[PDB]
Amino acid sequence: DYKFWYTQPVPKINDEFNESVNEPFISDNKVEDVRKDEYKLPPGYSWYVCDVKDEKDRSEIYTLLTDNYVEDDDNIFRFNYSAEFLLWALTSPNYLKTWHIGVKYDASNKLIGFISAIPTDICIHKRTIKMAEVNFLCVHKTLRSKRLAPVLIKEITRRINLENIWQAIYTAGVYLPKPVSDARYYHRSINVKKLIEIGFSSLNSRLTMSRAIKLYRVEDTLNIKNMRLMKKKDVEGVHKLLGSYLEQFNLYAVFTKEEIAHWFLPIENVIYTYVNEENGKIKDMISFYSLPSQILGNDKYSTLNAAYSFYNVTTTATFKQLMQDAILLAKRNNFDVFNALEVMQNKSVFEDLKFGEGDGSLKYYLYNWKCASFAPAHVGIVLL
Numbered sequence: 217d218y219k220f221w222y223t224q225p226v227p228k229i230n231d232e233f234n235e236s237v238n239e240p241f242i243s244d245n246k247v248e249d250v251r252k253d254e255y256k257l258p259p260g261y262s263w264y265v266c267d268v269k270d271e272k273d274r275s276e277i278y279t280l281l282t283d284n285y286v287e288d289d290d291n292i293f294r295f296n297y298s299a300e301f302l303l304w305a306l307t308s309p310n311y312l313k314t315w316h317i318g319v320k321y322d323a324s325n326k327l328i329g330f331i332s333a334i335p336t337d338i339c340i341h342k343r344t345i346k347m348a349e350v351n352f353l354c355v356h357k358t359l360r361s362k363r364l365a366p367v368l369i370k371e372i373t374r375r376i377n378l379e380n381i382w383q384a385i386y387t388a389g390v391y392l393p394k395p396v397s398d399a400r401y402y403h404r405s406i407n408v409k410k411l412i413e414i415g416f417s418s419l420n421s422r423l424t425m426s427r428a429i430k431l432y433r434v435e436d437t438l439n440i441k442n443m444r445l446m447k448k449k450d451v452e453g454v455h456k457l458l459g460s461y462l463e464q465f466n467l468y469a470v471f472t473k474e475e476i477a478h479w480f481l482p483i484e485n486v487i488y489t490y491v492n493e494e495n496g497k498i499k500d501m502i503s504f505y506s507l508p509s510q511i512l513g514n515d516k517y518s519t520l521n522a523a524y525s526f527y528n529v530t531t532t533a534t535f536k537q538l539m540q541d542a543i544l545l546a547k548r549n550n551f552d553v554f555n556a557l558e559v560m561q562n563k564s565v566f567e568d569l570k571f572g573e574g575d576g577s578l579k580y581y582l583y584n585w586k587c588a589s590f591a592p593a594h595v596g597i598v599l600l
């Protein structure tokens with residue numbers, strides 16, 4: 217019935233728009249009309265302004281997400297973003313502290329809910345719009361289905377609107393009104409035996425353990441011999457190679473140089489970017505971020521280390537060669553599995569590179585924006 221979502225400026229479940237329609241649901245908004253009062257929480261709970269740059273506040277958010285964030289369909293794996301990853305995700309250029317919103321239960325002083333946004337320029341069907349990117353919405357498991365999430369969403373919308381920003385982008389595995397695109401995820405096994413033992417992957421009578429390990433074996437040599445970790449000096453060249461590439465898609469972020477530096481310079485166990493430089497020119501890039509899963513109820517293993525394909529561009533090799541090197545560089549950095557979405561050119565390499573189709577998909581949404589939906593090959597943004 218979507219009783220909350222139907223009160224919001226998003227498409228109805230049946231809405232379908234021509235390619236010519238590309239505009240807000242509600243235009244001519246006025247900063248001066250936005251509510252100044254915080255939305256009301258139930259008795260005994262209060263808003264909390266989180267300082268993600270303080271280790272202790274950042275620790276509280278980490279604990280909340282570690283225990284209560286997203287689980288796979290079978291409740292065996294739960295995302296386990298690290299504290300340094302949350303730091304990086306939330307302190308991008310021109311971030312606002314007041315868009316990092318916690319909810320505490322007054323009597324324990326414990327964080328029980330969270331929601332965040334960062335500002336990003338988003339190009340949708342060739343119109344660039346100042347938006348908020350929303351992520352890390354989470355309500356403690358003990359307080360589910362109490363209608364707290366619409367409170368968090370309405371409060372962040374109010375604070376975003378105070379900055380004269382009236383559109384947002386977000387992704388969810390759940391179906392809401394109404395996806396602008398829908399991308400399945402695929403997984404390429406790296407540590408086969410481990411993935412079998414935790415029930416991420418399976419065997420069978422044809423594929424014995426030894427034959428499954430042989431199947432996923434990779435040669436420890438790069439297609440692009442000079443691919444190396446990105447350094448500060450490469451920010452200009454990355455901004456030109458990526459910025460040009462992305463303009464073909466129907467939905468992408470428009471990065472400034474300061475955004476390239478933030479989103480790509482390598483941070484161990486967070487973000488890995490590699491470049492191929494020729495003549496002082498960046499001609500190819502690979503990137504992926506680290507998003508481990510906590511494994512629930514396995515006696516031997518508690519963590520699955522997973523590399524998540526972010527942005528990959530090649531001008532000197534085939535896309536298949538580039539993605540093969542991405543898998544190898546993930547392997548060299550101790551990752552058990554390489555995960556990709558069917559966005560950009562990704563799907564075209566999944567069969568040859570031995571990726572397996574996963575169990576669900578990620579829906580891309582816009583808030584207060586009406587437009588034609590599109591196949592995921594035309595999606596040119598990867599969220600965290």
Ligand SMILES: CCCCCCCCCCCCCC(=O)CSCCNC(=O)CCNC(=O)[C@H](O)C(C)(C)COP(=O)(O)OP(=O)(O)OC[C@H]1O[C@@H](n2cnc3c(N)ncnc32)[C@H](O)[C@@H]1OP(=O)(O)O
Nearest residue numbers: 218219220221351352353354355360361362363364365382
């Ligand atoms: C202009 C600026 C605009 C800014 C804002 C833009 C929009 C931002 C929107 C947020 C984008 C976040 C993106 C993001 O973070 C990445 S998707 C990750 C979401 N987090 C998790 O799945 C963590 C585990 N789950 C939870 O913590 C709770 O289940 C949550 C908190 C998800 C819902 O808590 P609950 O205790 O289970 O539920 P109630 O409080 O009773 O609330 C039920 C209402 O919530 C609607 N709902 C449920 N899940 C949602 C989801 N993932 N997006 C949006 N809405 C969601 C649901 O359809 C229902 O509305 P309806 O009756 O109409 O159906």
Ligand SMILES: Cc1nn(C)c(C)c1Cc1nnc(-c2sc3ccccc3c2OC2CCNCC2)o1
Nearest residue numbers: 286287288293294295401524525555556557599600
């Ligand atoms: C696998 C998996 N493990 N777990 C713990 C979950 C809930 C899933 C399902 C899932 N839900 N979102 C995604 C994926 S796969 C992928 C590959 C490359 C880039 C992004 C993603 C992605 O979503 C990202 C970005 C949106 N938030 C979650 C991670 O995967």
Ligand SMILES: [Cl-]
Nearest residue numbers: 223255366370
């Ligand atoms: Cl209201």
Ligand SMILES: [Cl-]
Nearest residue numbers: 516517518519
């Ligand atoms: Cl482990």
Ligand SMILES: [Mg+2]
Nearest residue numbers: 361362363364
């Ligand atoms: Mg609730």
